[PDB]
Design a protein around this nucleic acid. Structure first.
Ligand SMILES: Nc1ncnc2c1ncn2[C@@H]1O[C@H](COP(=O)(O)OP(=O)(O)O)[C@@H](O)[C@H]1O
Ligand SMILES: Nc1ncnc2c1ncn2[C@@H]1O[C@H](COP(=O)(O)OP(=O)(O)O)[C@@H](O)[C@H]1O
Ligand SMILES: [Mg+2]
Ligand SMILES: [Mg+2]
Lengths: 654, 652
DNA sequence: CGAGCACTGCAGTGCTCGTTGTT
DNA sequence: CGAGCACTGCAGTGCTCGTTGTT
């Protein structure tokens, strides 16, 4: 309450932002200048000084990590006493709005979210069903196309081709794709955002209701917003809502998904009386780390520059280690962390960052061999594991037979006599009759259109699903899950998967029961099954979340934006890894990789360590990458090359 | 003794039996005692001419006819037959090749290749020669090859298509001789060549067998004739008996000209004709005569009898095959109920497939019966498989046995794997087991395959030695179990799986019994091939006799029933499609009718199912050829329909 | 009616080629 | 380098098509 406790630590610019009149404001500043601090305290100020209701506040951002950071700080300052307040990601809040107004959004209340793997599989099926050649029209490319369209709020009709074969056909795939999804009750990530926006365009009363409620909007890491997210925010505010956005154009790293830097300027041009407050003092890092970050970003052109200075001492130098290979690299990092831990440092204060999720495997193996606890975020996590996807598909079918993605994944898993031929018929019937896979089956059976054994095998499957639905129709989430895993036969085929592969695999199925068991959700209303499935999709990059045990934090450079750690290790500092080969294979996606390097460097509070491997094996071949150009861009006085302690063993003559 | 031998004979039979040693032909109609003469002649040669039993060879074509000679010889001379050779051409030829395999150029335990096996191999062979199966039917090759051997012709021979078959024939021989396989025709030809190439061997037999007697001479084809002619040379004395009106093997080389050939070639050859019939009633005999008279080129013959007319020939029109079968069982039941023996009843048919519905009706009526010919016990799938494992144990080169059980039970050796081994043998000029031995040794087969194939070769070797020191049946039972066949047939769909498991049991019991120039197992195997038609050894039990009209030639029964007397069955469609097929079929009907001693019964169905489809045949023309006073149709209604006077109407 | 064929499901296998991040 | 398949091989199953007689 006491305004006094809200402003004490804040400096000149921070106070100006926090204690400002209600109005559209942009807080623009480099990393670690306290923008998120300003955002959280602003919320506290709006509630105590401007007496705004918690219910009129919306705090939003793109990534789960940054949203969690906002939420955590909001809890510590105002206490968990923040009911009525919406804090989450654009996808999360969109999902929320959609569940609450599914009818107006033209969606079934229990719609299922389609993740990337599911979306790619559906597309691989649709394309083949359209007779299109595989290697000719990649489903991956179709996915990029479709998602890019949705990133720009464009539906199949909004766009027309002018001959352009590739364009006109991708257009057909997109039409069929949308048809299959709506018909199956499926919603992909991009659909959540677009549908949510369309909701307020088609339902003026619904929008009015929200414009009346959310009069205070706050967006963190604004430069992450793409066009559909920007539009959504603009709409919600109208000419009555007061918005505070904080961000840094030097940390723009989502150009590949529609987030353009112009968005910051657009806010200044579009929102009523919008103004700018620039923060200039960094509190996160040592001068050594900050000086390196500054020299690095300076290498990008086209930027009105920013101050960013600190009071802190130079601190330790930035370590640079040239590893023998990727294995030595991982072992070195673990060795360094052990030392930190042996001297009283928490493992959770250590982050290991990398450009691509594929780099975590070797790090993981080194951590495991050292019996050092760790948590990995992003990439192939728990809910994306084969056995877990299989288990959830049965539950998904129980919730909705029309779930074509679920149907395809387990209709014949474990094998039950329903081979490719039979399924090809089913898919053909869905294609021609414009029906869901389960729908098509119902007919092909009530028309004796299939062979004897076929229809019989297919009939049994449908009976097994209908059975599971009734049997567990009342069971609590976790027991229904235990049941399904056993009765589906999945538990059986996995036990006898042979090797240590099947063992860990059966454990994951056990861990899933626990997850559904310990699952906690609250505040409108959604059944446990749906709420769990949507959580597994929206916060998949999270996986299982034991968060109290001290453990090393592993994640991409992207997922780390917004976070900070006393010790930071950035591995794979080599041309072809970071910058990524794709950014190299292009001429200037380099400034964005450099902005990502800037993000990486500014995560370190006390110590930053950079590593690169003379050689590593990629795709069956040994490669000798050049050292990343970002290393040389740092000031030599801030960097200290690591020279392994000289030794000597027992003399061996001959 | 002498007296007994002549007491019952008529003038002509006596003349034949008590004649000096010389080449003689006894030509006479059915049932005139030709076989009686042949048998008594043997006794005469031993008592009066004091010829040694070791100098006598009595041979004929079919197992039934040979068994008939064997039986009468035994009833006339008992045990005074030791050293005497009595059997079939294939049988005696087989005994010779065993006793002189080295000189015949055959392994000690060569395996006889029956019809099924021969055809299968020819299918595998033709495909390997990249020949189009539909362009070169394996059935054609079989007909070609055997027909070639019926004449004693080797793959040499002297046309476009002619040269191809000639080649198929060549590969076939090489394949067989390599695997150590001998087909039925190979037995006759090889036996004959054995005398053409081994003078000292021929001399030994000409010195031993100075007395040759052949029954049913008109069954001899060209290779069998040569064989006999050669054995007799210019020193051996021969008696051949037969009747050209009973020539029914034209389809396998047997020609009427052979009887005349005998009179031309054999030194001092003379003919003696018998005329009196002692088998049948006058009714049956006159129907037979009217029947045979419809064939042209006949010189007459026509035998008679002193016997009374006896019962007429019953004619029954059945409503379908099943009714035909049940009607016959009904008639036989009455015969039995009046003290008649079942074995005095024979049910004859044109083709073996007709026995099935008959067997079904007999089983349903719990009437004991015994079938000869066609798909017999040793022809059964399960029995064949079990005997194939036994064959590979006696010779891994047995390609027929190999490819039959290599993947039965299924053991991972699929068709793809086998196709490789096949082209391997085809080009490497070796057997299948030899191709597998190599390919495996010189690692050329995938890990999955190679591990299964050898796994099989290992199994056989195990079985081979594991049972080399035990009894036949013990060895059989063992091989049936360890081969997996037992387990396989036990799970086999309960649609017939049981009976098959029961047949395998019978196989053991059969091997358990069974009755010395060869090992027990090789004797059993060869018997199953040469006498396959006999099926399982018969008990003493009284039972109805079922067999084709062909197999019945030489036999006689108080009661004879001939079923399927329908156009399309007898004579069949195929008999109206070629030269003198129809007349040969009529000769077969003459043979059928003349088997009957007291009563003959002819039946035909208004409808029957052939290859599944329902047909409606007209009664056989042979029925209409019989004199109406010899036949009495079986009434299907009791009253005589009242004549229907014409009603003068203009309505449609 | 009964022996081979055509089909379909399933397991074991070399062969190809993507190849950056987040929801 | 390894997921994803395209292939290949083996089997179980439902349906098509036709052959005298003997050793
Ligand atoms: N005025 C201040 N006094 C002391 N610490 C501060 C102040 N402002 C921010 N911080 C601390 O500095 C660190 C980085 O600031 P942060 O909010 O995360 O920066 P930004 O969001 O701009 O990247 C945090 O540990 C934060 O708690
Ligand atoms: N002279 C005879 N007196 C009495 N019965 C005879 C006489 N000759 C033959 N038989 C009997 O007549 C029947 C038929 O004679 P069989 O030798 O079989 O004729 P074929 O061989 O000429 O067809 C037999 O039952 C036979 O034992
Ligand atoms: Mg921040
Ligand atoms: Mg006779």
């Amino acid at each position: 309450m006491d305004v006094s406790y809200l402003l004490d630590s804040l400096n000149d610019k921070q106070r100006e932002a926090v204690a400002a009149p209600r109005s559209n404001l942009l807080v623009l500043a480099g990393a670690g200048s306290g923008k998120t601090r300003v955002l959280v305290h602003r919320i506290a100020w709006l509630m105590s000084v401007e007496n705004c209701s918690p219910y009129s506040i919306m705090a939003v951002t793109f990534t789960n990590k940054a949203a969690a950071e906002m939420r955590h700080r909001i809890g510590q300052l105002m206490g968990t006493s923040q009911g009525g307040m919406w804090v989450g990601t654009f996808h999360g809040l969109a999902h929320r709005l959609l569940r609450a107004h599914h009818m107006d959004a033209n969606l079934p209340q229990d719609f299922q979210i389609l993740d990337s793997e599911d979306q790619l599989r559906l597309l691989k099926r649709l394309i083949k069903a359209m007779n299109l050649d595989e290697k000719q029209w990649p489903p991956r490319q179709a996915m990029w196309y479709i998602n890019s369209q949705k990133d720009e709020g464009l539906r199949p009709h909004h766009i027309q081709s002018y001959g352009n074969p590739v364009e006109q056909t991708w257009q057909k795939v997109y039409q069929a794709y949308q048809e299959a999804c709506d018909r199956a009750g499926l919603v992909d990530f991009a659909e959540l955002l677009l549908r949510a926006h369309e909701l307020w365009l088609n339902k003026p009363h619904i929008l009015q209701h929200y414009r009346e409620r959310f009069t205070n909007i706050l967006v963190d890491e604004f430069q992450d917003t793409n066009n559909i997210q920007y539009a959504w925010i603009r709409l919600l505010a109208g000419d009555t809502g007061k918005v505070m956005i904080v961000g840094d154009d030097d940390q723009s790293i989502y150009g590949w998904r529609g987030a353009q830097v112009e968005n910051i300027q657009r806010f200044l041009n579009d929102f009523p009386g919008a103004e700018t407050i620039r923060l200039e003092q960094n509190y996160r890092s040592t001068s050594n780390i900050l000086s390196a970050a500054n020299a690095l970003i300076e290498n990008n052109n086209g930027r009105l520059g920013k101050k960013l200075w600190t009071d802190g001492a130079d601190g330790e130098p930035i370590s640079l280690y040239c590893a023998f290979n990727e294995l030595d690299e991982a072992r070195f990092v673990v060795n360094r962390i052990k030392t930190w831990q042996d001297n009283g440092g928490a493992l959770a204060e250590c982050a290991i960052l990398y450009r691509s999720n594929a780099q975590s495997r070797v790090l993981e193996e080194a951590l495991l061999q050292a019996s050092m606890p760790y948590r990995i975020y992003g990439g192939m996590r728990f809910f994306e594991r084969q056995e877990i996807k299989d288990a959830l598909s049965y539950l998904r079918l129980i919730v909705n037979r029309n779930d074509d993605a679920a149907f395809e994944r387990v209709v014949n898993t474990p094998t039950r006599g329903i081979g490719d031929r039979t399924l090809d018929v089913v898919r053909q019937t869905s294609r021609d009759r414009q029906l869901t896979l389960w729908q098509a089956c119902r007919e092909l059976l009530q028309e004796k259109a299939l062979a004897g054994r076929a229809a019989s095998a297919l009939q049994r499957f449908m009976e097994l699903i209908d059975a599971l639905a009734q049997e567990t129709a009342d069971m609590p989430l976790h027991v229904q899950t235990d049941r399904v895993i056993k009765d589906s036969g999945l538990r059986t085929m996995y036990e006898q998967e042979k090797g240590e592969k099947g063992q860990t695999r059966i454990e994951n199925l056990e861990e899933l029961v626990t997850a559904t068991r310990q699952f906690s959700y609250n505040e409108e209303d959604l059944m446990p099954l749906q709420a769990f499935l949507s959580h597994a999709a929206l916060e998949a990059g999270e996986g299982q979340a034991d968060t109290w045990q001290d453990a090393v934090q592993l994640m991409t450079l992207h997922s780390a934006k917004g976070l900070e750690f006393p010790q930071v290790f950035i591995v794979g500092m080599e041309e072809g890894m970071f910058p990524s080969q794709m950014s190299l294979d292009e001429g200037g996606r380099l400034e964005e990789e450099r902005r990502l390097a800037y993000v990486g460097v500014t995560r370190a509070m006390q110590k930053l360590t950079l590593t690169y491997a003379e050689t590593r094996r990629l795709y069956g071949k040994e490669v000798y990458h050049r050292p990343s150009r970002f290393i040389g861009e740092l000031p030599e006085e801030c960097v200290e090359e690591v020279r392994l302690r000289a030794t000597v063993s027992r003399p061996v003559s001959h």
